[PDB]
Amino acid sequence: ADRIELRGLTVHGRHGVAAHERVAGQRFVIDVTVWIDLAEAANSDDLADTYDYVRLASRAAEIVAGPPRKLIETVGAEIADHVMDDQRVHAVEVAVHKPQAPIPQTFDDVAVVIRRSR
Amino acid sequence: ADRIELRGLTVHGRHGVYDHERVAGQRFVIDVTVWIDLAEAANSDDLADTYDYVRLASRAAEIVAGPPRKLIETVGAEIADHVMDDQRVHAVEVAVHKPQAPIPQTFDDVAVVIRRSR
Amino acid sequence: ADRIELRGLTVHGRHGVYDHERVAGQRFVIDVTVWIDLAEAANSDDLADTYDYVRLASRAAEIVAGPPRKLIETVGAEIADHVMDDQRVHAVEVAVHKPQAPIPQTFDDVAVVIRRSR
Amino acid sequence: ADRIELRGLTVHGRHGVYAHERVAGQRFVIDVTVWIDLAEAANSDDLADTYDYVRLASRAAEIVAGPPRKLIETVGAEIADHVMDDQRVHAVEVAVHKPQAPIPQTFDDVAVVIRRSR
Amino acid sequence: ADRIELRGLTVHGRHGVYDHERVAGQRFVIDVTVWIDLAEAANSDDLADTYDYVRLASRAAEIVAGPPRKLIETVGAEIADHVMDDQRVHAVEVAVHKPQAPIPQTFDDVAVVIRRSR
Amino acid sequence: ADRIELRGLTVHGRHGVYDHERVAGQRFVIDVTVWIDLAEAANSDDLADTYDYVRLASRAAEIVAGPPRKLIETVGAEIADHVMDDQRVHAVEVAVHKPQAPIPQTFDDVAVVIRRSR
Amino acid sequence: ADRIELRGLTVHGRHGVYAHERVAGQRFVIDVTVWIDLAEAANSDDLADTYDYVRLASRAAEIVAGPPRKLIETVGAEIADHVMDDQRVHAVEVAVHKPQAPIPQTFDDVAVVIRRSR
Amino acid sequence: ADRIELRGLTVHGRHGVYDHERVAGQRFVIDVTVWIDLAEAANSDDLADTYDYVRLASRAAEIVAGPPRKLIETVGAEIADHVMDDQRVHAVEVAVHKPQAPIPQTFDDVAVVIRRSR
Ligand SMILES: Nc1nc2c(c(=O)[nH]1)N=C(CO)CN2
Ligand SMILES: Nc1nc2c(c(=O)[nH]1)N=C(CO)CN2
Ligand SMILES: Nc1nc2c(c(=O)[nH]1)N=C(CO)CN2
Ligand SMILES: Nc1nc2c(c(=O)[nH]1)N=C(CO)CN2
Ligand SMILES: Nc1nc2c(c(=O)[nH]1)N=C(CO)CN2
Numbered sequence: 001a002d003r004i005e006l007r008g009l010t011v012h013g014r015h016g017v018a019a020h021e022r023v024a025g026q027r028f029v030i031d032v033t034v035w036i037d038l039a040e041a042a043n044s045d046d047l048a049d050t051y052d053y054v055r056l057a058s059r060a061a062e063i064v065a066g067p068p069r070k071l072i073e074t075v076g077a078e079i080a081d082h083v084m085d086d087q088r089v090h091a092v093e094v095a096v097h098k099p100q101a102p103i104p105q106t107f108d109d110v111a112v113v114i115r116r117s118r
Numbered sequence: 119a120d121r122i123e124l125r126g127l128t129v130h131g132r133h134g135v136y137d138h139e140r141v142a143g144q145r146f147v148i149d150v151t152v153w154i155d156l157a158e159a160a161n162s163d164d165l166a167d168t169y170d171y172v173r174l175a176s177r178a179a180e181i182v183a184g185p186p187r188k189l190i191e192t193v194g195a196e197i198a199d200h201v202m203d204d205q206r207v208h209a210v211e212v213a214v215h216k217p218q219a220p221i222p223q224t225f226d227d228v229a230v231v232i233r234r235s236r
Numbered sequence: 237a238d239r240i241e242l243r244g245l246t247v248h249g250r251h252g253v254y255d256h257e258r259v260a261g262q263r264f265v266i267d268v269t270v271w272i273d274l275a276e277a278a279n280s281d282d283l284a285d286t287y288d289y290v291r292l293a294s295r296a297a298e299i300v301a302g303p304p305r306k307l308i309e310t311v312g313a314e315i316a317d318h319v320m321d322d323q324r325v326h327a328v329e330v331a332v333h334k335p336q337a338p339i340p341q342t343f344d345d346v347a348v349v350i351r352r353s354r
Numbered sequence: 355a356d357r358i359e360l361r362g363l364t365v366h367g368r369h370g371v372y373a374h375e376r377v378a379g380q381r382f383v384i385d386v387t388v389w390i391d392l393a394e395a396a397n398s399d400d401l402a403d404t405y406d407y408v409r410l411a412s413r414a415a416e417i418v419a420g421p422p423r424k425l426i427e428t429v430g431a432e433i434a435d436h437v438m439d440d441q442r443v444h445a446v447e448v449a450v451h452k453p454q455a456p457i458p459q460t461f462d463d464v465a466v467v468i469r470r471s472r
Numbered sequence: 473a474d475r476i477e478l479r480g481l482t483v484h485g486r487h488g489v490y491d492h493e494r495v496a497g498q499r500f501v502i503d504v505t506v507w508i509d510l511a512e513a514a515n516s517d518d519l520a521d522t523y524d525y526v527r528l529a530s531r532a533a534e535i536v537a538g539p540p541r542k543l544i545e546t547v548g549a550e551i552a553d554h555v556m557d558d559q560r561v562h563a564v565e566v567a568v569h570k571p572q573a574p575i576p577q578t579f580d581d582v583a584v585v586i587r588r589s590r
Numbered sequence: 591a592d593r594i595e596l597r598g599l600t601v602h603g604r605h606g607v608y609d610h611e612r613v614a615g616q617r618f619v620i621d622v623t624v625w626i627d628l629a630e631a632a633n634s635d636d637l638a639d640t641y642d643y644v645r646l647a648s649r650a651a652e653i654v655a656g657p658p659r660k661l662i663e664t665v666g667a668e669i670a671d672h673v674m675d676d677q678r679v680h681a682v683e684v685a686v687h688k689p690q691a692p693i694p695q696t697f698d699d700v701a702v703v704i705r706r707s708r
Numbered sequence: 709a710d711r712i713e714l715r716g717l718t719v720h721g722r723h724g725v726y727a728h729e730r731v732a733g734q735r736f737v738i739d740v741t742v743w744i745d746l747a748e749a750a751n752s753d754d755l756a757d758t759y760d761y762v763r764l765a766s767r768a769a770e771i772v773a774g775p776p777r778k779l780i781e782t783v784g785a786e787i788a789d790h791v792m793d794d795q796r797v798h799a800v801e802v803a804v805h806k807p808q809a810p811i812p813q814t815f816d817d818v819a820v821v822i823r824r825s826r
Numbered sequence: 827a828d829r830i831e832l833r834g835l836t837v838h839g840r841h842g843v844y845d846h847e848r849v850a851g852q853r854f855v856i857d858v859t860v861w862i863d864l865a866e867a868a869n870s871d872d873l874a875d876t877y878d879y880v881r882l883a884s885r886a887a888e889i890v891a892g893p894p895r896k897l898i899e900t901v902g903a904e905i906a907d908h909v910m911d912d913q914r915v916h917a918v919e920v921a922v923h924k925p926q927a928p929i930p931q932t933f934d935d936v937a938v939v940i941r942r943s944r
C-alpha cells in the first residue's frame with residue numbers, strides 16, 4: 001500500500017457559493033494521499049523514481065490560491081486531476097477542508113474528499 | 119471513494135438511559151461521512167449537484183437537539199436514515215459521540231457508529 | 237487571587253467592522269476571569285456566597301449571540317460591565333477571541349482582553 | 355460497519371516483562387471497537403438490544419487493573435474474548451497502549467491490537 | 473518563584489449543587505501549584521527537604537473522590553488548606569476544573585482557583 | 591491590563607546565523623501583545639479608537655517574510671518598534687518562535703520575547 | 709488484523725536530496741505497523757512468542773539516525789525489510805514523516821508509507 | 827521582561843528517589859526561560875550579544891541525560907546555575923517535568939520550577 005501523504009497544507013483562498021464569501025476569503029486546508037509503487041525509488045535513492053512531495057505541495061497551494069470556485073468539490077478535483085497527470089500514480093485522494101465554513105453551527109471541520117484512480 | 123466529511127459537530131442534548139441524564143442533558147459530538155459521486159459537482163461547480171454540507175450540519179443538530187432518546191444508537195440511526203433519503207448517497211456513517219458519558223472510569227470518548235448503505 | 241475561570245465559551249455571532257463579516261457571522265470564543273473572594277463560599281458551601289458560573293456562561297453567551305457590534309472590544313466591555321454589577325467582584329478580565337477573523341495571514345488566534353476593576 | 359467505539363480508557367496497571375515494571379506499574383490506555391448490528395437497538399431504543407458501553411468500560415478496566423501479565427498481548431486477548439462472549443458481536447478489536455513503555459527512545463505510543471471475529 | 477506544579481489530576485467525584493449531579497457524578501480535573509523554597513532540597517538531594525508530589529497527588533485525589541460538596545470552591549479550599557499544613561509552603565493555588573459541567577452552552581472548561589498564603 | 595493579543599502568526603522566512611539556514615529557510619511563528627486603553631473604543635465602537643489587528647498582522651508578517659536577520663531578537667525588535675509607533679500604546683511584547691530550529695535535540699519550541707514600554 | 713503499532717518515534721537524522729539538508733539535519737517521525745499472529749503469545753505470555761516492541765524501536769531509530777539517504781523512501785524500505793526478517797510477520801507498513809521538510813508552504817506533515825508483505 | 831524561552835526539551839534520564847525508577851529510566855521534559863536584555867543584540871544582529879539557544883539546549887540535555895539525581899529539583903538547579911554563569915543573565919526559570927512519574931493516580935504532568943536571580 002505504498003503511498004505519499006501530505007497533511008494540513010494551509011492556504012488562504014476565496015472559494016464559496018456566495019459573493020460575500022469571496023470578498024475576504026478564508027482558510028483552506030488540504031490533504032493529499034498518492035498511491036504509487038515506491039520500491040524502485042528505495043532501490044535507486046533517486047528522486048526521479050518517486051513523486052516529489054515538494055511539487056505536490058506547491059501545485060496544491062497554487063490551485064487553492066488561484067481562481068475562486070463555488071465548490072470545494074471543484075478545487076479538490078483540479079488537484080486530484082493534476083496528480084493523475086503522473087501516469088505512475090495508481091490513485092489519489094484529495095481532502096479539501098473548510099474549517100471556517102460560515103455555518104451557524106459549532107463544529108471542528110467540514111471537508112470533501114475527491115478520489116481518482118486508474 | 120468520493121465523500122463529504124463533517125467532523126465534531128457539537129450540540130447540547132438530552133439522550134441517556136437514566137432519568138438523571140435528561141435533567142440537564144450533556145454535550146454530544148457528531149461526525150457524518152457521506153459516500154457520494156462528486157464528479158458532476160466538480161464538473162458543474164453547481165451546489166445542486168452535490169450534498170450541501172450546510173443542511174447536513176443543520177439537520178444533524180436539530181435531531182440531536184430534539185426529542186430525547188434513551189440510546190445514542192437511535193439518534194445516529196435517525197440522522198443516517200435522513201441522509202439516505204437523498205438517493206445520490208451510496209452510504210453513510212454517523213458517529214454519535216458521548217464524551218461526557220457519566221461513567222466512573224477515565225476515558226477520552228465513547229461513541230456508536232451507525233452505517234447505512236444501498 | 238481567588239478567582240472563577242470560564243474558558244472557551246464558543247458562540248456564533250455577527251460582530252465585525254465591514255458588512256461582509258455580518259452576513260453569515262463567525263465563531264467567537266470567550267474567556268472570563270472573575271476575581272472575587274471565595275472564602276465564604278468555601279465555609280458555607282452555599283451557591284449564593286459565590287458567583288454562579290451557570291448564569292455567567294449564559295449571560296456571556298447572550299451578549300455574544302446578540303445584536304452585532306463593530307469591535308470585539310465593545311463586546312468584551314459589555315460582558316465585563318455585566319460581571320462588575322456584582323458588588324462582590326474585585327476585578328474581571330474578558331477575552332473575546334476571533335479565531336476565524338477574515339484576514340489573509342495564517343494565524344492561530346486574535347483577541348482583545350478587556351479589564352475592569354472597582 | 356455498525357460498531358461501538360470506546361477510546362482512551364485510561365487505567366493504572368502492572369503488566370511488563372521486567373520485575374521493575376511490577377513494582378509501581380504504569381499508565382495503560384485501552385481502545386475497544388465492537389462490530390455489532392445496532393439496527394434493532396435503534397428500533398426499540400432498548401439498552402438490552404445493544405452492548406452496554408458502561409459494562410464495556412468497567413470490565414476492560416477491571417482486567418487492565420487485574421492480575422499482572424508479562425505481555426500486553428495477553429491483556430488484550432482477555433478483553434477481546436470477554437467481548438466475544440456476547441454472541442451478537444461479529445468481531446472486536448482491542449488495542450492495548452503502553453505510552454509510558456520504559457524504552458530509551460522518544461516516541462508517542464506503542465501498542466498491540468488483538469482481533470477476534472467469527 | 474520556586475514551585476511544584478501538578479497538572480491535570482483527573483478524578484471522578486460527585487460534587488455539585490443540584491441533586492441530578494450526584495446520581496452518577498462526573499470528571500473533575502485538579503491543578504495544584506505549591507510555592508516553596510527548593511534550594512535546600514537541591515542542596516541535599518533528599519526528598520525530606522521538599523514537598524513530595526506523590527503524597528500531594530494521592531491526598532488531592534482522596535479529597536476529590538470523597539464525600540460530595542455542593543461547590544467546587546469547597547473542594548479547592550480543602551486541598552489548599554491541606555497543602556498549607558506544611559509550614560514550608562509560602563502559598564498555594566488549587567484549580568478545580570469541572571470540564572463536564574451540566575450547562576447548555578458549549579465551552580472548553582469552567583474552574584475555580586483557590587489561593588491561600590501566609 | 592487592557593490588551594490586544596495576536597497568537598501564532600505563521601510565516602516562512604530565512605532568518606538565522608549560519609548560511610545553511612538561509613538556503614531554504616524555515617517556519618517562523620509570531621505572537622504580539624499590545625497594551626493599550628480600550629475604553630474609548632468600546633464607547634465609540636469606532637475602529638479608529640483602537641489598534642487595528644488587521645494592519646498589525648499584515649505588517650508583522652511583512653517584517654518576518656522580509657530580508658533575513660541573523661537573530662530572531664532583531665526581527666522581534668523591528669515588530670515591537672513598529673507597534674510603539676502608535677503613541678497610544680503603553681507597551682508591547684513580541685514573541686518570535688523558531689519551532690523548526692535546526693538543532694540535534696528533541697524539543698517543542700525555542701523563542702525570544704522582546705518588550706518595549708513607555 | 710492482530711498487529712503491533714509503534715507511533716511517533718522521533719529521531720534526529722540527515723536524510724535529504726540536497727547537501728544543505730545533511731549539514732544540520734532535521735527531525736524525523738516514524739510509525740511502524742506489524743501484522744503478525746499474536747494468539748500464541750497470549751497463550752503463553754512469553755516474549756519469545758511475539759515481536760519485541762523494544763527492539764522494534766531500537767532498530768528503527770538506529771536506521772533513521774544512520775547513514776543519510778536522499779529519500780525517505782529508502783529509509784522506510786530498510787526498516788520494513790528489517791521487520792520482514794522475522795518469518796512470522798505477515799506484512800508491515802513503515803511511515804516515515806518529515807514534519808520540518810524545508811518547503812516554503814505552510815503544512816502540518818509530509819510522509820511516505822512503505823508496505824511489504826507476503 | 828526581554829527573555830529567551832526554550833520549551834519541551836525531551837531527554838531520557840534515570841532520575842528518581844526509588845531504586846525501581848533507576849533500572850530503565852524515563853522521559854524528562856525541560857523548559858528554560860532566560861531573562862537578559864536583548865536590545866544590544868537587536869542593534870548588532872550579532873549572536874555574541876545574546877544568549878545562544880543552541881548551547882542552551884545542548885548543555886541542558888547533557889545535564890538531564892547525565893548521572894541521575896534523586897530529585898528533579900537538583901536537576902533543575904544544575905541547569906539554572908549553568909545559565910547564571912553568564913553574567914549578562916538577570917534571572918532564569920527552569921521547569922523539570924516528569925510526565926511519566928510512577929504514581930497510581932491519573933494526571934497529565936508533574937514538575938518543579940527552579941528560579942535564580944541576582
Ligand atoms: N458539499 C458542499 N456543500 C456546500 C459547499 C461546498 O463547496 N460543497 N459550499 C457551500 C458554501 O460555500 C455550502 N455548501
Ligand atoms: N451502547 C450503549 N450503551 C449505553 C447507552 C448508549 O446509548 N448506548 N446509554 C447509556 C447511558 O445513557 C448506557 N449505555
Ligand atoms: N482591535 C481591533 N481591530 C479590528 C477589529 C476589532 O474588533 N478590534 N475588527 C475588525 C473587523 O471586524 C478589524 N480590526
Ligand atoms: N510485543 C511486545 N513486546 C514487548 C512487550 C510486550 O508486551 N509485547 N513488553 C515488553 C516489556 O514489558 C517488551 N516488549
Ligand atoms: N462558582 C460556582 N458556580 C456554580 C457551582 C459551583 O460549584 N461554583 N456549582 C453549580 C452546580 O453544581 C452551579 N454553579
Ligand SMILES: Nc1nc2c(c(=O)[nH]1)N=C(CO)CN2
Pocket residue numbers: 605606607608611660661662663702830873876877878879880
Ligand atoms: N538567542 C539566540 N540564539 C541563537 C540565534 C538566535 O536567533 N538567537 N540563532 C541561531 C541560529 O540561527 C543560534 N542561536
Ligand SMILES: Nc1nc2c(c(=O)[nH]1)N=C(CO)CN2
Pocket residue numbers: 004047050051052053054723724725726729778779780781820
Ligand atoms: N517523495 C519524496 N519527495 C521528495 C523527497 C523525498 O524524500 N521523497 N525529498 C525531498 C528533498 O529532500 C524532495 N522531494
Ligand SMILES: Nc1nc2c(c(=O)[nH]1)N=C(CO)CN2
Pocket residue numbers: 476519522523524525526841842843844847896897898899938
Ligand atoms: N517534589 C518532589 N517529589 C518527589 C520527587 C521529586 O523529585 N521531587 N521524586 C520522587 C521519586 O522520584 C517522589 N517525589
